[PDB]
Amino acid sequence: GSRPTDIKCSASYQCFPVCKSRFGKTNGRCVNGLCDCF
Amino acid sequence: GSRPTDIKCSASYQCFPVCKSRFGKTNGRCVNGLCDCF
Amino acid sequence: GSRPTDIKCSASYQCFPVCKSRFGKTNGRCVNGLCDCF
């Protein structure tokens, strides 16, 4: 399942560390300026 | 609890690798230019 | 061996979280604007 975050982004690569750290998730995408995790 | 670092940052997404490496912490923030780890 | 991604990058340091999360790979490189993992 997916998760939102409060971490600002312009590109997907920036989302991989928060998504791993916070949720142990392996996939991240930048959506309307914030990281989501999948 | 929280731990500071000496590591300069322009955005919070940059602080997650720092915080995991340095402290095993899963959360962090770029706080007025330096990573804090929570 | 190599597993290319469609994750945008400008610098190889940006690719290591990508490559670790997506493939368990401990190396990579930004190659023509995209992360490549080995």
Place this chain on the structure above:
Amino acid sequence: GSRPTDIKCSASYQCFPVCKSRFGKTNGRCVNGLCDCF
């Protein structure tokens, strides 16, 4: 011990993912334009 990389950097936050991923190191520092790990 220390490890060198051929990964370009302008700031030491950028070295933490490579140093963790390649070497399991907990510290990184940008030196003469390249990440070093310890």
